[PDB]
Design a protein around this nucleic acid. Sequence first.
DNA 1: AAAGTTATCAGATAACCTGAAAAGTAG
DNA 2: CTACTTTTCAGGTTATCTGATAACTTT
Lengths: 212, 212, 221, 208
Amino acid sequence: MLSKSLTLTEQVARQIAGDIAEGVHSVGAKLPPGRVLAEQYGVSAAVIREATERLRAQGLIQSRQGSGSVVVSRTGAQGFQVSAGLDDREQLASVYELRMELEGGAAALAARRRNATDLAAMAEALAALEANLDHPEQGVEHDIAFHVAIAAATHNRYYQDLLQYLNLQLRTAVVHQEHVAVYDAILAGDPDRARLAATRHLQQAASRLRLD
Amino acid sequence: MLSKSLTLTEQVARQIAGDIAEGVHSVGAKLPPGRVLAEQYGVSAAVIREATERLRAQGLIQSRQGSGSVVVSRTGAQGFQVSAGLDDREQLASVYELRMELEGGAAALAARRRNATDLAAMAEALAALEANLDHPEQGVEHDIAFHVAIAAATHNRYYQDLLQYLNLQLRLATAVVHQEHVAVYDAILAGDPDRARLAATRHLQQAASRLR
Amino acid sequence: MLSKSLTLTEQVARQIAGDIAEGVHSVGAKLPPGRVLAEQYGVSAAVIREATERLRAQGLIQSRQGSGSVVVSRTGAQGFQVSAGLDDREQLASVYELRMELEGGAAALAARRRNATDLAAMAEALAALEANLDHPEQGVEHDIAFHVAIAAATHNRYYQDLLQYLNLQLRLAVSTLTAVVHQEHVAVYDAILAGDPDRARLAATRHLQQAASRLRLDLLS
Amino acid sequence: KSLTLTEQVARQIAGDIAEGVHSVGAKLPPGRVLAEQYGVSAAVIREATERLRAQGLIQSRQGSGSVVVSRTGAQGFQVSAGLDDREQLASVYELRMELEGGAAALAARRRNATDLAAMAEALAALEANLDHPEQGVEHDIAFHVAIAAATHNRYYQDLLQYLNLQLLTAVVHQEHVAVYDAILAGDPDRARLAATRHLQQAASRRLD
DNA sequence: AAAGTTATCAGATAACCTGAAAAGTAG
DNA sequence: CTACTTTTCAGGTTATCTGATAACTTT
Ligand SMILES: [Zn+2]
Ligand SMILES: [Zn+2]
Ligand SMILES: [Zn+2]
Ligand SMILES: [Zn+2]
């Protein structure tokens, strides 16, 4: 009652996931039915279906209808990097410099990939940015949502997200003119000028924050 | 093969993920009673309760039985790993793209930060690449180890940690090739920032036209 | 809702009907037999086995127990909307995104062509509508005719076929006030009595761009 | 050979549908009661209930079951490829004029990379057969389909494909490209424009 | 305490799988 | 004859429904 007791849903997982690394149901073998896990665990259809997604999501098992479920990686390959907000020098310079290659290379694609509706998102976004130059406490979201728009303009369904993450880290006129420059570059459909003024927008930012 | 379709379950989590990434549901913020999300996203709670779990496993929300679902993150369990496979040579190509973008500045930021053993690794396998110009199966464990150098030469783990993972799951699912593998060695080892970015891009983009 | 990502069954035919129309299975040819077809697209026995019979009612090919299946045509028994399903909101939001652009031109032709016989029913049904913004259910029987006879004002029986079909399934589809609805309806008529192509093109578009905004609002309400 | 066990149901069913038994909006009995009302295999049903879907009497949610949506089927024909040409065909050409109008516009606000793929490749499959115009018809076939696809709308592109299934070059291409670059520029109203000139012209070429 | 969420059980119907037993025609 | 494909059975798991019940927090 008092503390978040592990409900069955989660409990059933750590039973099964153990076996994936305890060696029982080896890699590529077929997990049992659901009707059996119900019996094996005295739980119900509903609970089973839920727990299964715990394993698909942590990337240890997959499924197709009718076949059942295939195990993949005993560990569970749920692994990437980059935190957000906790300051620790030079390792910080290992990341911004990375996005410099990234923020520029993305806008270099939108120079061949922005359409009308893409600009319409970047439109009110920078329009929402210019409307709070005196209030920089609101334009965070849009400094993202504008930076965001360059990824949405990349039309790369994957690339988009990897960017989409990076920004969601924690943390006036000199800040905003580096922006509308890459717009008149993305507006133009200009390849390297978008790859530039973007890299330069972050170029100044990464040393301006090293001065913070 | 065909593109593996998407369940309601995971299309729900992805579109709710974005609804978290666009800060519509910020941290501390409870989430709509799923009974509304059924009506909103159109399904029945069967899939709701499932998609729910996909999150609480990728670590984006928690819920307490009684007190609704609460958001507390915008980062994922790890980052994001496309499963790729036969799913979309398109969404797969949505990476060869970026894996070369990275490899643009990657060869570059080595050319300004290339050590001895860096280039002395770039050469050790460069010899084992030469003789194995007639062992096109022994010379496999070389081409990556080659590109690895550039990445390890960056002295930037994030940058380096990132690409390995990309390269890694990429291969999950020599004459003109080695000449093309070569043109960057003169580029990295001669202080040329963009010429390293230049002939390296020439590499993978030929190989992609070698594959596509 | 969202994109009811299709059944492999129908995901298949909509590559095979396309493959047929790609001519790569030029008519009179025998399709690669079932054994092959699973592996080509990567599906099971009862998918092909099904997606086949979709072509045997769509009539694209005929099958003979032993010979196999021979493409006998590249066009079906007509074109068909193929939707109106519960939970097909992305499929439905793909419907309205056409009858619109249609009912924009289905005013332009009516703006360039007409009798009074068109403007007969036009003022007739709008009158049958104006006097009946009070029993919001009987007037549904007339939003047909106004929209219907607006197409009749175009004088193209194959246009008139198109709309009446699409219109058919939406009435079947949304198997669930009248003032701001009746206004926009008249707004088309004004640019069509005074006869104006590009003026009625918009005001018609606005009707659908407003009546569907009073449809994507009640579903999530 | 008589009618298949499969069809022996489809045209046994449409009766009880059109005989108001399985009235519209009612749930079709489950794919287990049918084999148990009929004495066939449950794996027969899947085809029968695949006929009635493409025959537009029903659709089904993967849990609720199957529900009829018509009592006969409103197929909605538009047959022929020639004869009675006069302007009856030109009225068809009048229709498609607006669809080619609306469609290209929708390519300009949401085209993608896979869009400019064959749209540039069918523009390239066409430009190299300008003096072999018995070959590029298959491309003027497909080049439309290409941008027709860029709608991402199943039905839009799709029911456009069927018309091109009813039966100089240095010019009609200049109209093919003016529309092309519009979506290639993302200008939607210019997309709806630079297209139909192509369509207004080949039909003016009714004179044939 | 009662209104309102999450979590779980009870009972069920459509997709999609795998393989063997019929029923046929192209060799 | 064998060998190739088509239509059927039988026996199977997954997705996704829809209803109630249970445990718990909110108000
Ligand atoms: Zn910024
Ligand atoms: Zn190589
Ligand atoms: Zn109306
Ligand atoms: Zn043409």
